[PDB]
Structure formats: C-alpha cells, structure tokens
Amino acid sequence: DSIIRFSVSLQQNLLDELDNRIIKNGYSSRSELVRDMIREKLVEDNWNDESKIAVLVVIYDHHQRELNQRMIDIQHASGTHVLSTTHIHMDEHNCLETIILQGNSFEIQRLQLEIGGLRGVKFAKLTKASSFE
Amino acid sequence: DSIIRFSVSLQQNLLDELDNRIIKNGYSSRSELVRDMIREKLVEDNWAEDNPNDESKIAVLVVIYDHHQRELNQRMIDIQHASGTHVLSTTHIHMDEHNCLETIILQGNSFEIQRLQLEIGGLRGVKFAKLTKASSFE
Numbered sequence: 001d002s003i004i005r006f007s008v009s010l011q012q013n014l015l016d017e018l019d020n021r022i023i024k025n026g027y028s029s030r031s032e033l034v035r036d037m038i039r040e041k042l043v044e045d046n047w048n049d050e051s052k053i054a055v056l057v058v059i060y061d062h063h064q065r066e067l068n069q070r071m072i073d074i075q076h077a078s079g080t081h082v083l084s085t086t087h088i089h090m091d092e093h094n095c096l097e098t099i100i101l102q103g104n105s106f107e108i109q110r111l112q113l114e115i116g117g118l119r120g121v122k123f124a125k126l127t128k129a130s131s132f133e
Numbered sequence: 134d135s136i137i138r139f140s141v142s143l144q145q146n147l148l149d150e151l152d153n154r155i156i157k158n159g160y161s162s163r164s165e166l167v168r169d170m171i172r173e174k175l176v177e178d179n180w181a182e183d184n185p186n187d188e189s190k191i192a193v194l195v196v197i198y199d200h201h202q203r204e205l206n207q208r209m210i211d212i213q214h215a216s217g218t219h220v221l222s223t224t225h226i227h228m229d230e231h232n233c234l235e236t237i238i239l240q241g242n243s244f245e246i247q248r249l250q251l252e253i254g255g256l257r258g259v260k261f262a263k264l265t266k267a268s269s270f271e
Contacts, residue, residue, distance in 0.1 A: 005142040009164040017175045031142045041170040042150050055195050057265045086222050094269045098236050122270040127195045127263050
C-alpha cells in the first residue's frame with residue numbers, strides 16, 4: 001500500500017475516447033477511471049499447465065490483404081487446437097469471428113495477444129471458460 | 134511524437150498485480166497492457182450507450198451448462214424467445230456428460246441482449262454465462 005504513479009503512453013483517439021467517457025460519466029480524472037478499469041480487468045480475468053477450453057471473439061476488416069493467412073499462421077504456431085469457428089458478415093468492412101479453442105492458459109492468452117495486434121483486427125476478446133481434456 | 138503520455142496515480146497493491154500479469158503473460162510494457170484494457174472497456178461502453186435502441190447491435194453469449202438436467206435447454210429456449218433478440222448462429226460443444234459449452238451470436242438492442250444474458254445466468258444448472266459485445270468499426 002501507498003500510492004505510486006506511472007506514465008501511460010497513448011495515441012490520440014484512444015485518449016479522445018477516454019476523455020469523452022470521463023466527461024459523460026462524470027468521472028473526476030483520468031487517474032480514477034484508469035484505476036477503476038485496471039481493478040476491474042484484473043478481477044474479471046478468470047482461470048498448472050492443464051489444457052482448457054476458451055472462446056476468442058475477433059472483429060476485423062475482411063478485405064484486408066492476407067489477414068486470414070496472418071491469423072492462420074499465428075494459431076498454427078500457437079500450440080492451441082481449434083474446435084469450431086463461425087464467420088458473421090456484420091458490415092461491408094466488418095467480419096465477426098467466434099473461435100472455440102483448447103490449449104493451456106498461456107497459449108490461449110498468447111494467441112489473443114498476437115491476433116489482437118495485427119493490422120486490420122479491431123477487437124479480440126478472450127472468454128476463459130473451463131478446464132477441458 | 135504521435136504518442137501522448139499522462140500519469141496515473143495508483144495503489145502499490147494494484148500496481149503489483151498489474152506488473153504480475155505483464156511478467157506472467159509476456160506483455161512488453163505497462164502502457165500496452167493498460168492501453169488494451171482501456172480500449173476494450175471504452176469500446177464496450179460505447180456499444181451500450183450509443184443508439185441504445187438500435188436493433189442491429191450484435192453480441193456473443195458464451196454459456197456452460199448441464200445439458201443432461203431436465204428442462205434446462207427448453208427453459209433456455211423459452212427465455213430466448215421472449216427476449217426480443219434474434220439468434221444468428223449457435224454452436225454446442227459437448228465437453229463431458231455434465232458440461233456443454235455453447236456460443237450464441239445475438240442481435241437486438243442493448244437492453245434485450247443484456248436482459249437475456251441475465252435471465253440465462255440465473256438459471257439453476259447454468260454454471261457460466263459471459264457476454265462479449267461486438268461492435269462495427271469505421
């Protein structure tokens with residue numbers, strides 16, 4: 001306990017989104033909102049190298065050059081095993097994909113990290129479900 | 134350059150838990166992890182607060198339940214039918230005798246979707262019920 005402060009680096013639009021939300025919801029500062037976002041994401045992260053089942057929801061631009069190959073290459077090296085996938089064409093530029101996969105905590109978390117950072121991927125949320133053999 | 138830096142005051146207790154995930158999960162920095170959490174929450178916020186009555190919102194419901202307990206599935210279908218949402222797709226994976234994992238892709242306004250998730254979560258035999266909000270980007 002105590003209080004320590006560290007610096008956070010953002011691009012403009014993430015900052016814009018954050019400041020817009022602060023103003024609408026009557027939050028007092030950036031420090032408070034981020035603090036509450038950290039404390040919440042930490043708690044909701046719910047899960048030994050035992051294999052598990054999880055769900056990865058991805059939203060991306062379908063006409064992006066070789067993005068699918070990019071995602072395939074990533075999950076092939078991931079060590080995870082894919083069970084099922086569904087592709088929803090939400091929009092002209094938006095594709096929703098749900099992926100049911102199994103692996104250990106680390107591979108599954110890592111798969112989300114790498115898929116999230118690809119250009120053309122705008123959303124990549126992981127739902128940790130349960131132990132699974 | 135193109136990057137803005139601002140300061141976050143915080144409990145050492147909270148800082149340590151955050152630093153643990155960075156090390157545990159192989160994150161490059163605090164900023165990248167914090168950025169990612171913020172961006173996830175901010176997006177989900179906008180999903181529920183802009184055009185709240187838009188019927189074209191899409192979300193994914195992930196449920197784990199016992200499928201060999203009586204009336205549970207029917208009860209769940211009853212609930213979905215009164216929700217006012219539309220099911221786009223569903224997948225069931227039978228994990229074992231007492232556990233089934235299904236993904237449901239929904240469409241409706243934020244209220245209907247959030248009430249559906251709530252009614253299904255409260256069910257006896259439904260062990261797990263978690264919703265992801267899917268939004269269209271420009």
